[model samples]
Target chain A: PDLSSFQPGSIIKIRLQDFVTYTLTEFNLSPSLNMIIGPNGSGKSTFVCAVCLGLAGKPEYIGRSKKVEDFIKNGQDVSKIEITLKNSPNVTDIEYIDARDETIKITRIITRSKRRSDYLINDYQVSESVVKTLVAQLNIQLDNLCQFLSQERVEEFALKSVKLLVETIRSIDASLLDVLDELRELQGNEQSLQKDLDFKKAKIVHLRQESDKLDESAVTILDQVTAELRELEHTVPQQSKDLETIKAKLKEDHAVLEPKLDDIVSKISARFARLFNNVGSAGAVRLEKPKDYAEWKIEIMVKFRDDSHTQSGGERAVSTVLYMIALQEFTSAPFRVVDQINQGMDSRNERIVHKAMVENACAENTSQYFLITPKLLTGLHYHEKMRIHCVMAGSWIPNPSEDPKMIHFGETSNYSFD
Target chain B: TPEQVKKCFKKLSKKLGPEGSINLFKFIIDPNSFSRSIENLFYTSFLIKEGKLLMEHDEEGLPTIKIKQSISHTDSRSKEIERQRRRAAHQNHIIFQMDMPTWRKLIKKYNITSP
Candidate 1:
């Protein structure tokens, strides 16, 4: 397969052997919208777990098990997971002499008996650090909830810290992060230079005082000679009086002249209010200024009822969904995975959010969007870019021994093999 | 140098009568030499510092110098009184330099003839 035709950083294939809920499986992914539908406990979340763990991500990030060996099948002693990501010349940080292959294959082997895990890149044994570095170069953020939201981590996404949210958004623009680092370096240098200036000024003042003290004795002898020469002269009192008068006037004149004393948020707020009002509520965004620059904060205010009180669980879920949609207008990533995020949302809000997501995610040049749900409403608006995949695996369903053929509908209402 | 400064002060006093004042440029300038004019300025500064000459600005804002009349005090008087008198007097010192250009300007302004 010519992998160069695929979008960089997009998933090409995922293969699992003796992993959770799969004895052996291999599935290809789309570079655009991917909708995964399945009943409860049918391994819809297993794909999300594999993507996170296979990319040098922390096991704790998946919220399933902290130990890597826990992901092995119950009856199997070892589990092997391999993920193939599309690679291009633009994605790699440095060009390698042997990097002619257009695909990057990352493999992770886990053994429950020995409690050990091994990492490999393109079938060659490598350290975990190398895999992480490749993942960073590809801009794959499996830990950021904005990029990868698992079913177990859905609630965490709603209550994410502001700092973490900014970090995730800032990761989209590499130059923005570079500029921030440069700004911090210059600020540190400015403070160091200011300290040096203050020290030099103090040293100059001390040296001047030392020199003045040394001249005091000689100045006394000179004053005595001046007093002797002035013994025969007169008319000093009138000049002294005139000098005092001028000094008084100059002081008065010197005392007189002394005294003197968001476009992104608005657009996001407009979208936020429009989305919330569609669900029959009010919402607003307020950017607050604090005494310190770093202490600045953004507040999301919502009113579901006539008066204000704590919102219900479902209401908060709706707000979180709408807020996420509003925030998406400003950020971009390679791909985003959201699993069961609409669990607590009402049916009306779920449909509305689905329509919004379909329209937003299916647009041209948007990120690859993966929305995992137990079920979707009938007769909802869909886009041409969207590809829906329904999972059919349970104790009641028969397992296929061969590769399943995909059938595409033709113009004459006949099915053809793809 | 002190004797030369005293002779210059007497000449300046004679040039001004009892209560008349002379323009400062006329008193300090030597028409023949720029160096002599600068030396005259240095001697005039000492006479003014000793209160033998009082310097004041004329109606045109040019500095003028006049002799100050003196009254001798008795030797029997207390030295404390003399010190008090000196402390009560306000004296201001300023720097005056005469370059060749400035000497020529003053010579033209005061219409001094070469001696």
Candidate 2:
């Protein structure tokens, strides 16, 4: 045994004395794959039974008699089976390790009269359970059909259920079986928890079904109330049209009282044409008399070229500014304010519009005019009546104490009228 | 008397035969006399309590009675120790009910004519 070193789970030596078909037998096994070939009753299976019994395996596991004493050779009072299993650092049970050895020698002695078994590990007497635990650590599974299949149990292997096969495969890794057991336990817990959840869910569904019946009655009441409100809502449009008809009749009566309206419109159109001529465009303002009083409005038509569509953007701006100026003549307001009116006009049209605004606004009987522009053309004409206010307010402005001195135009020019 | 109990045990053993065991219903049921059937069950329970008979149920949940094999000194000592150990441990007692209806059903199921 010392000369042959084997891997864990390898049978380094198998010795039998007074066992079935073997009066005395001892053999060394290979560390690699081993085969036993012989004809019937060659005691090949006897060595297998020796391995099983020596490792503290149950007698029934090998399809042998339930009594261990029956395995003794006929006419013999006792049987001894010794199985030497190689041990490695990775796969070993050190619980019974008073003195460590490379090989574990398991011995089982069966007495016919006593019908009892004595187990030993490495020649030290130990309990059968201890021997079993040590053998399991060596990854030897006598009861697993995939690991050890006896001749009588060979047919059982072919008919093995998939569940048994999965168990056998899982036996190779101890942790795998542990995890599988844990998984099965958790799955059982989940199923029980799910059953409770389904029970509560069914109760909730039953309660909701009862609640919906009550909701159905409330819905009928709500529908009746909504229908009553809808009956009131149906008169809204009809009353609105009746009010519009009365307003139209009043507007017609007011027009009849203003008999000079035609004369006023003619005067406004003549002034509009005169103002547009100064900007090198022709335009006229007229009243729009539609069938509906609400549709009545003033329309301004301007012609900058033979076709009105040929007019440029600046020409349109000029026409709009002149029309506004002409319409201002009829307003009774005390002052008129035009802000950024020259926004889209060219420099030529801007100057002409500015001059016209000054001439019309400065007349003795005319109202005040406010022209607000961010940028004025250089060297532009200014009227003595015009007052320019420059706003200076920003984050960068000088403080009052740090203000620059202001120089005014001579007092002699301020007194003179243009 | 002990003689009458021994005779009753012998009658059951004869029904069990050399095979070591037999269906409990076959050993106890008497189709002709329900009273005799009840007496047979009572006697069998006494044999089990004395360790002369072993009772176990099969996969079908029907009971079977087997004659106890002869025990050696070591086995008897071990059994005595185990019995004492069980006496010190908590035991779950199960209640078994047997009525006339149940007895008649078993007789028909097992087709028993004599005990």
Candidate 3:
């Protein structure tokens, strides 16, 4: 491959030194297409490396090796590649390119001991970014296999065949390459976000189960309270009904007793008239109820005389005895007593009350009677069946006028002297 | 046909003046070739001629009829009769002709005040 005479007046020239298969060499590439046909080991590949390196292409772009230092001559300390290119006015209307130099020299240097390569443009140190941009302006499609080829790359390209090459070209379209990369990044984010969504959904399901369990327990307690409340609700009407029943029974009792009470008073009044022998000052007993008397309690009033006049104590005593005698007629008790009832009465009234008492006691089926009085009028009569008994101490008290000591000294002789 | 006949008769009377007279035979049959037309005209005219449309056949057997003019024919008077007839018809709820006295009584009952 002999392209050493292809350099134009303003086109680039390449110089490579201390590179693979070359110690030092200079080549002015033809402005036209290069058709290199050479046998093996003729430094043709070395020419390719210098051109690629001078054009600011990466070492991997040459397809023969992966490292820039690998292109250096064996055991060499450093390798250098220089390209001198025409810096023509860029016809493209890019705003930032004010003017360019008349010529540009790009040199790349690689050292065996360094991890990275160094670049210089126009003999001034420059970064790889500037070199890439300047090479990109040269319209070199380094990514296209059709534009760049090494012996090994050409061999691999020939092996892939035609149909796959067409597909590979399409896959490298600019947006497709970006989309494939974008898809990889977005899928990772999507996987992470989906995982988070599933985690939160799991928590929601757990919380819902717990809340449902709590609701069930609360419902059980609520049902229990409702049953208790229902029982309490029934108690009010039941208790009120029981109270009404008792009140009705009390009213019935009062109704039955009122007329009996009236009849008793009537009989007592009639008996009083009989007992007094139709005395000029008449006496009667009537039942009366106080205004404030309870519905459950009935009170009876006694009248010994009419409203017109006052009766003597003796008259009242006779009436009281007669009332008691009349009550005993209905009461039918085993016994009745009037304790000194004639204390405040004259002897005349006393005899009359005593006669009444004896008469009441003599009634058919009557109870026993005891008229306990200090003394009775001599004119009084007693029931023939009445039995009298006296309660005595059966012992005598010492006379107060006697001195106990004198008695002891024999003043009262022969009493207990024996 | 009756209406047309009557119209023709009325127009002829006016055209012939007060002294004019109609000979039914010549008026219709003598109108050139309208003899076929005269039979319809004569029949229609006879239907509405006064009380009796007299027809006399000559001894030689020629058909003849005398259609007399209406005794009462005035637009105003006829319109009056039409209105009164309409009132009577409405009173009876169907078209009819009755004596004037009873018709007026019916009209009075219905309060028909129009002319």
TM-score of each: 0.53, 0.32, 0.30
Provide the RMSD of all predictions against the true structure, rounded to 1 decimal.
Answer: 50.3, 55.6, 74.0
Please give the lDDT score for candidate 3. Answer: 0.45
Report candidate 3's interface RMSD in Å.
83.9
Alpha-carbon runs more than 4 Å astray in model 2: A1-5, A91-100, A155-161, A172-418, B1-115
For candidate 1, give the lDDT of residue B32.
Answer: 70
Q: Which 10 consecutive positions of candidate 3 chain A have the poorest summed lDDT? A: A406-415
Please provide, for model 3 over B9-102, each residue's C-alpha lDDT reduced to its tens digit, 9 standing for 90 to 100: 4665568543444433334332222223233433333332222233333444233444444456577767678756744442200001111112
Better of 1 and 3 by TM-score: 1
lDDT of 2 by residue, B1-107 (tens): 52246776677557655437666456567776554554565455445545576555445745667776655456565778776685445221111223333455567
Per-model chain B TM-scores are 0.70, 0.69, 0.32
Question: Candidate 3: where are CA atoms >4 Å away?
Answer: A1-11, A91-100, A154-172, A177-418, B1-115
**What are the candidates' individual DockQ scores?**
0.00, 0.00, 0.00
True lDDT of residue A109, candidate 3:
82
Ranking by TM-score: 1, 2, 3
lDDT of 2: 0.52
Model 1 Cα lDDT, one tens digit per residue, A184-277: 4444444555565465555545545544553567678556545543441233444445545544543433232111003455676798888777
